[PDB]
Design a protein around this ligand. Structure first.
Ligand SMILES: Nc1ncnc2c1ncn2[C@@H]1O[C@H](COP(=O)(O)OP(=O)(O)OP(O)(O)=S)[C@@H](O)[C@H]1O
Ligand SMILES: Nc1ncnc2c1ncn2[C@@H]1O[C@H](COP(=O)(O)OP(=O)(O)OP(O)(O)=S)[C@@H](O)[C@H]1O
Ligand SMILES: Nc1ncnc2c1ncn2[C@@H]1O[C@H](COP(=O)(O)OP(=O)(O)OP(O)(O)=S)[C@@H](O)[C@H]1O
Lengths: 689, 66, 132
């Protein structure tokens, strides 16, 4: 009949063991069984934001009907799954669709309430077939659903429900809602245990349980786009794929095979020898590693097959619980379970001995790796190159920020606290306020952080807070509210964060905005959510927020001498307290205070700038050495307190680059020959020797 | 004819307004921020009422409410 | 037909934002709704490839067919990797355009394409300089 063609059984697929187990979800299955057994409106629609277990509840209803854990009214109710794409796909002629759908309704009338009809994507059904001569497929189920003769079960999203069904009230009240909520973390762990069983059976691994509780908690923490318990299953199954791929191929095999083919090419080119002997030793070594690798493959295959046969035994004992064989129960239990479990653990300790050439069980290191590659955030546990990089923090920021002990110490501390796992997970990592007079390293400290962290300077979401002199600011970083002009495009801060969730947010020259633009940042630095105009919040709990004012230039350049750092911090905090509001300087992690530069700092800056100048000319095709007296003149001619370090920049720029640009375009200084910048009487000469 | 309550919390900063309200949501719904939290420091201009009401008919986000 | 192949076929749908609203006639099944119960059961092995602003416009508008897919973020390559790509495609373009290309031409094209052209993104504008 029509139900042969246009429907798929679900009680077969819960009878044959093709559907995943459904664990938890007490109240929703009880409420769905309430709503299916009425006289009118037998129509629950399962409504929740997508992936929190909506189609899984119809899976659970199919499995509870087959196992028989339901009330007696449902025992025997087939669950037929309808798909609209099988109904429509033939209906080329007029009324073919109406014939098919009437045939489905009559073959469900001939069952006498026995078949629970399962439409998935109920949002789709409204208007399926609307054409010139049509019945819209909602106007053929409004009568049959109105009288309760059909036991349809709806499975739709929430925003698809606002868009498609509540545009049409006459089919909105045919259906009762069952609000499937987002499941909690502990129930997520339960769901992950049932599917731990299932995914270990598929992808040939062993999933340790601390990996599961870490996957639930870390997925709930970091990935904020999607919704539980589906993001945790994403981390688990992708970690299992990673473990199976690392099982499938080592890397010492790559090194040794490329080594033996390289030495084979070399020896055949040389045809003294010694390479016959070395190649024979490497071939014996590679054969040893290959044989050990095949032994590990055979051992893991035997262990996974014997685990699969153990689960076959559990399937058989549940079949016996449904049927009721007598000797089969005690036979399967007391024979099959303990001996296969003890030899499964014998295989477990055997693999713990023999796996050398490794990771063979999905553990929480791999969950950390898959979640660090998913988002962007450095979730993972450190490697030793990154950890020694991360303790050379203050070293590798003094390669570019000479001077300024204090803030390099502070920001080093903040990124170290984020990497160890001690940050407050409700606030961003570093919410700093770099103060200090004009041009002493602030924007270059932030660029030093970006070159350290991301290995690029132009990877930092850099709001420029001196364009923000009116409240047009607010409207240009949180997007355009609905009805208005740029609602289709969104803001700059929110979108440019939600791309890369781990990014430095540099708010350059922060006092130049209007004083009530420091109210977006109340939300940011308090909680790290920032609701833009399209409506959705944006996770700023993984950024580093740096605002580089210079509110106290007079005070710092006046009194950085003869005062310690603590009193200076408190006093310029008093000045900032006069400028900002008390709601906002409370939010800040640490207000640092920079300082004017001294002469030795200026000499070191001069050496850094001459490093990049030599880099420029070596890219051009030249070389320059310098005299130390030339550096002394650049030091003595570039000291002034009120301007900081850019006097050195334009003094270098003039007193080196301008006669050098006079001479390079003179056709005078031939490339390849070493240039020495010895002093003149007061100028700097350039020679060719 | 009213909501349950409508409280206007006052007081200088860092004494526990926002954590009192998160304490309520943690009691009532067994989750800290399972609540409709509107930031009233985005609405510094008059035309951003329509983020919460929605869009009037014949405009951009009319299909999507507040 | 692809279910008959027993998972031996990886699909490849470039421009996935075409797929989302594809066959959307006067209220009928587009491509999104028919594929949407066959994606998140693994019986199809699609590989998307989309521009990012097309993702935010045309896929995250529709949250179900969003969460069937995995974002695999492909960042703009660095300069040296661009140089490697240009060396392989130097082999290919020296086959095509009957001319010879030298290594200073490649490193000059990569450096000057990154520093000066501000519109398009690497490695594409390097290959456009080389081809032009
Ligand atoms: N409570 C649960 N018990 C068992 N498996 C679950 C549960 N919640 C989610 N899952 C798993 O989540 C995956 C998909 O969840 P679904 O409920 O199918 O999402 P969904 O219902 O299709 O939401 P949409 O709107 O249809 S995309 C499957 O692998 C299920 O096994
Ligand atoms: N310790 C330092 N090491 C290296 N360069 C430094 C150091 N301190 C200052 N500079 C230089 O100072 C120049 C100007 O500093 P910037 O950070 O660019 O100015 P700023 O710090 O933003 O201050 P303002 O108020 O914004 S002008 C930079 O180009 C750096 O090269
Ligand atoms: N009475 C309190 N009990 C416990 N924690 C508190 C208390 N007051 C503040 N906190 C902590 O401070 C933060 C909450 O500060 P809030 O008082 O909520 O700031 P606020 O109430 O919004 O006042 P403003 O507007 O932010 S200045 C959280 O980190 C809390 O742990």
């Amino acid at each position: 009949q029509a139900l042969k063609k246009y429907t798929i059984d679900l009680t077969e697929r819960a009878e044959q063991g093709k559907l995943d187990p459904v664990i938890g979800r007490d109240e929703e299955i009880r409420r769905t069984i309430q709503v299916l057994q009425r006289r009118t409106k037998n129509n629950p629609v399962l409504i929740g934001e997508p992936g929190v277990g909506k189609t899984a509840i119809v899976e659970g209803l199919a499995q509870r009907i087959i196992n028989g854990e339901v009330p007696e009214g449902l025992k025997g109710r087939r669950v037929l799954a309808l798909d609209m794409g099988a109904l429509v796909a033939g209906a080329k002629y007029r009324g073919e669709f109406e014939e098919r759908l009437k045939g489905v309704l009559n073959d469900l009338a001939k069952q006498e309430g026995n078949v629970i009809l399962f439409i998935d994507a109920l949002h789709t059904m409204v208007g399926a077939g609307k054409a010139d001569g049509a019945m819209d497929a909602g106007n053929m189920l409004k009568p049959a659903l109105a009288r309760g003769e059909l036991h349809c079960v709806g499975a739709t999203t929430l925003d698809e429900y606002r868009q498609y069904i509540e545009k049409d009230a006459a089919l909105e009240r045919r259906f009762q809602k069952v609000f499937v909520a987002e499941p909690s973390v502990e129930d997520t762990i339960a769901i992950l245990r049932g599917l731990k069983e299932r995914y270990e059976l598929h992808h040939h691994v062993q999933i340790t349980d601390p990996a599961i509780v870490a996957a639930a908690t870390l997925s709930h923490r970091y990935i904020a786009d999607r919704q539980l318990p589906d993001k945790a299953i994403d981390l688990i199954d992708e970690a299992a794929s990673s473990i199976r791929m690392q099982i499938d191929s080592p890397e010492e095999l790559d090194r040794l095979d490329r080594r033996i083919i390289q030495l084979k090419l070399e020896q055949q080119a040389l045809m003294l020898d010694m390479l016959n002997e070395e190649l024979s030793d490497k071939e014996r070594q590679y054969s040893e590693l290959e044989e050990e690798w095949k032994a590990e493959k055979a051992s893991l295959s035997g262990t996974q097959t014997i685990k699969a046969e153990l689960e076959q035994a559990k399937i058989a004992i549940e079949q016996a619980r449904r049927v009721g064989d007598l000797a089969r129960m005690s036979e399967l239990q007391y024979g099959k379970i303990p001996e296969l479990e003890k030899q499964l653990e014998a295989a477990t300790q055997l693999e713990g001995k023999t796996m050398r050439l490794l990771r063979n069980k999905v553990t929480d290191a791999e969950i950390a790796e898959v979640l660090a590659r998913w988002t962007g955030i450095p979730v993972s546990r450190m490697m030793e190159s990154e950890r020694e990089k991360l303790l050379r923090m203050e070293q590798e920021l003094h390669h570019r920020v000479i001077g300024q002990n204090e803030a390099v110490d502070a920001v080093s501390n903040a990124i170290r606290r984020s990497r160890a796992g001690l940050a407050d997970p409700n606030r961003p990592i570093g919410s700093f306020l770099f103060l200090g007079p004009t041009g002493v390293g602030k924007t270059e400290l932030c660029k030093a952080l970006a070159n350290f962290m991301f290995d690029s300077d132009e990877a930092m979401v850099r709001i420029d807070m001196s364009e923000f002199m009116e409240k047009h600011s607010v409207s240009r970083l949180v997007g355009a509210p609905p009805g208005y002009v740029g609602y289709e495009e969104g803001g700059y801060l929110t979108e440019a964060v939600r791309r890369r969730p781990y990014s430095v947010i540099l708010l350059d020259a922060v006092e130049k905005a209007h004083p009530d633009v420091f109210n977006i940042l109340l939300q940011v630095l308090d909680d790290g959510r920032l609701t833009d105009g399209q409506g959705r919040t944006v996770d700023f709990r993984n950024t580093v927020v740096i605002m580089t004012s210079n509110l106290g230039s007079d005070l710092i350049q006046e009194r950085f001498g003869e005062l310690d750092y603590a009193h200076m911090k408190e006093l310029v905090l008093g000045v900032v307290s006069h400028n900002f509001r008390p709601e906002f300087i409370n939010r800040i992690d640490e207000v640092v205070v920079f300082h004017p530069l001294g002469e030795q700092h200026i000499a070191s800056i001069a050496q850094i700038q001459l490093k990049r100048l030599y880099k420029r000319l070596e890219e051009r095709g030249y070389e320059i050495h310098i005299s130390d007296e030339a550096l002394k003149l650049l030091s003595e001619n570039g000291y002034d307190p009120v301007y900081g370090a850019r006097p050195l920049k334009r003094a270098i720029q003039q007193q080196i680059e301008n006669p050098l640009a006079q001479q390079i375009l003179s056709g005078e200084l031939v490339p390849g020959k070493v240039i020495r910048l010895e002093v003149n009487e007061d100028r700097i000469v350039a020679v060719q020797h």
